[PDB]
DNA sequence: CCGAGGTCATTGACCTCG
DNA sequence: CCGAGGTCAATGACCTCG
């Protein structure tokens, strides 16, 4: 399977979605920690398996688009 | 914007005699001082970009090197 | 200014467990 | 295998010299 934020391979569907590990680990520490983050252009950068870590808050928010739900996050 | 002649992320200038992103900038500087040999788990022929740069270190130090990248000027003596 | 030589928070491949 | 949790070597953005 693929993960549907950033077409990287998927091994499962952790939080909800088919997700990689990358887009996994990310949104867990990003809840886990609660980070915000900004966007240096608009809020419509790329993310993809190539270009995911050029914008957090881009590919958090997909994250959010693409169904990973929070609570699905424990934590410590 | 530039280019890195390694992978085509963004370049952010020369390292060791060729222009390259800080990414490959610091892959091979580590590489290098650590001597570092790596076996390509793939077909020994990885193509490079942002995502496979990370997926081969073999394939992705042997494009640093073909692309002018010096480990004579990783830190040499003096 | 550039670039050599780090520093250190984040990334993501690999594990364990129920 | 699935999918929660966890780990930590490698990675790469940012920093300080020469
Ligand atoms: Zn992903
Ligand atoms: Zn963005
Ligand atoms: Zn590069
Ligand atoms: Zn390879």
């Given at each position: 399977?693929?993960?549907?934020?950033?077409?990287?391979?998927?091994?499962?569907?952790?939080?909800?979605?088919?997700?990689?590990?990358?887009?996994?680990?990310?949104?867990?520490?990003?809840?886990?920690?609660?980070?915000?983050?900004?966007?240096?252009?608009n809020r419509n950068c790329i993310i993809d398996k190539r270009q995911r870590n050029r914008c957090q808050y881009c590919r958090y928010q997909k994250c959010?688009?693409?169904?990973?739900?929070?609570?699905?996050?424990?934590?410590? | 914007?530039?280019?890195?002649?390694?992978?085509?992320?963004?370049?952010?200038?020369?390292?060791?005699?060729?222009?390259?992103?800080?990414?490959?900038?610091?892959?091979?500087?580590?590489?290098?001082?650590?001597?570092?040999?790596?076996?390509?788990?793939?077909?020994?022929?990885?193509?490079?970009?942002?995502?496979?740069?990370?997926?081969?270190?073999?394939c992705r130090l042997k494009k640093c090197l073909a692309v002018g990248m010096r480990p004579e000027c990783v830190v040499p003596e003096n």
């Amino acid at each position: 399977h693929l993960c549907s934020i950033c077409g990287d391979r998927a091994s499962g569907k952790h939080y909800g979605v088919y997700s990689c590990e990358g887009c996994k680990g990310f949104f867990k520490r990003t809840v886990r920690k609660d980070l915000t983050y900004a966007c240096r252009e608009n809020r419509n950068c790329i993310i993809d398996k190539r270009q995911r870590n050029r914008c957090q808050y881009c590919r958090y928010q997909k994250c959010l688009t693409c169904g990973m739900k929070r609570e699905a996050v424990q934590e410590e | 914007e530039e280019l890195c002649l390694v992978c085509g992320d963004r370049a952010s200038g020369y390292h060791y005699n060729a222009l390259t992103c800080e990414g490959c900038k610091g892959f091979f500087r580590r590489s290098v001082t650590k001597s570092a040999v790596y076996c390509c788990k793939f077909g020994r022929a990885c193509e490079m970009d942002m995502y496979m740069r990370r997926k081969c270190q073999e394939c992705r130090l042997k494009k640093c090197l073909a692309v002018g990248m010096r480990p004579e000027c990783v830190v040499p003596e003096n």
